[PDB]
Chain A
């Protein structure tokens, strides 16, 4: 006298299954990104300004060495 055994869902039911789209925001604001970009640009401009002025002075020194050696 064996009872019926068959593939059935568990008593109660199965757990919920997600189906809706899940695309989070995961980002900053436009103002923040623009601000960081401009800040990086300004820092780079300042550094290159100092470096290029120093390079101009070094080139002047090299040219003076050449001038002293020319005669």
Chain B
């Protein structure tokens, strides 16, 4: 509570480069775990269609699978265009 303050003052007076490096590295470690945009980044990476989407053979009881790309079923990227 009082030792750490004096140590930080001495470090800022003597080695500001090391203090800045440790602060920036600590922020780089901590901040991603507390951000709601990390999930959005994962979703954006998952939304990129690198390969062809192979169609499924219609067996007759897949309601959620679309029959046309413009059909309402399937994943939606509406959350992305508003981001």
Show the binding face of A for B, using Cβ within 8 Å: 53, 56-57, 59-60, 63-64, 67, 70
CA distance A53 to B45 in the complex (A): 11
**Smallest CB separation, A37 vs chain B (Å):** 11
Main secondary structure on A side of the interface with B = helix
The one of B50, B53, B81 in contact with A57, judged by C-beta atoms closer than 8 angstroms, is B81
B80 on the A face (CB < 8 A): yes
In angstroms, how far is the closest chain A Cβ from the Cβ of B36?
A: 14
Residues of A within 8 A of B44 (CB): 53, 56
List the 9 closest A-B pairs by CB distance, nearest first.
A63-B49, A70-B52, A56-B44, A67-B52, A67-B49, A53-B83, A60-B48, A60-B47, A57-B80
B77 at the interface (CB under 8 A from A): yes
A49 to chain B, nearest CB (A): 9
